């Protein structure tokens, strides 16, 4: 067996309207020994369930077992340790796994919105760019809107660490040349811990 432990989605720890989950994905366990007692600790303390919810899957030639501990937004943002432990008897030792966030001291992102190049108006689809820089931790969420409503047509690059010791990203909205030329408002909406209400937005208009 092998125990992976994933974080909550940054959007989901950021937004009180959302619900953050710490997912402990073990792939193996075996038959004759399926009896994997999940153990969930938060900072020091065991949480019993704390609404822990393992749902059994029957895969490969083996079992895929996952328990999802739901987290308080506050706690993870204040970085507690989310320690997953998997038991069994076919398993000589309790497989331990700790997550928490980054640990650094938050840095507020810089959101500048960049228009298409003139050489790109020779194309009849253009691209809209948002540069988000100098944030920390890497835990961010950018999205795009048209006029006031969701644009599904975007691609965001992974946060990559800059010379600064910060993170940066780009997000590229591809719109129609006409759709830009008609002076239509576009906007990139960035969500990170170190923003005004965990939320900000910056507009691109012709």
């Amino acid at each position: 067996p092998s125990v992976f432990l994933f974080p909550p989605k940054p959007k989901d720890t950021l937004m009180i309207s959302r619900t953050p989950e710490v997912t402990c994905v073990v792939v193996d366990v075996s038959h004759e020994d399926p009896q994997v007692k999940f153990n969930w600790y938060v900072d020091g303390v065991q949480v019993h369930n704390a609404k822990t919810k393992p749902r059994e899957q029957q895969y490969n030639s083996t079992y895929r077992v996952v328990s999802v501990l739901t987290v308080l937004h506050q706690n993870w943002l204040d970085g507690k340790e989310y320690k997953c432990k998997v038991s069994n008897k076919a398993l000589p030792a309790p497989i331990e796994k700790t997550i928490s966030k980054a640990k650094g001291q938050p840095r507020e992102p810089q959101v500048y919105t960049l228009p298409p190049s003139r050489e790109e108006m020779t194309k009849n689809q253009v691209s809209l760019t948002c540069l988000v820089k100098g944030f920390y931790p890497s835990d961010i969420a950018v999205e795009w809107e048209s006029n006031g409503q969701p644009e599904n047509n975007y691609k965001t690059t992974p946060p990559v660490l800059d010379s600064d010791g910060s993170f940066f990203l780009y997000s590229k909205l591809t719109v129609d040349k006409s759709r830009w030329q008609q002076g239509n408002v576009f906007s990139c909406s960035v969500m990170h811990e170190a923003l005004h209400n965990h939320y900000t937005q910056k507009s691109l208009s012709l």
Binding site: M15, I16, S17, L72, H73, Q74, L77, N197, H198, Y199
Partner: protein, 43 residues
């Protein structure tokens, strides 16, 4: 996102003197009744 549920959430989260349980309470009642979401602050 939507509401001041989060605007309220933010504040109560960043309350310097709103000690632990004092905070946790306010944040959780604030998940439970967004309506009441406006009820913030002790210290």
């Amino acid at each position: 996102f939507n509401k001041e549920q989060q605007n309220a959430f933010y504040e109560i989260l960043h309350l310097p003197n709103l000690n632990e349980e004092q905070r946790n309470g306010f944040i959780q009642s604030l998940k439970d009744d967004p309506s009441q979401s406006a009820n913030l602050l002790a210290e």
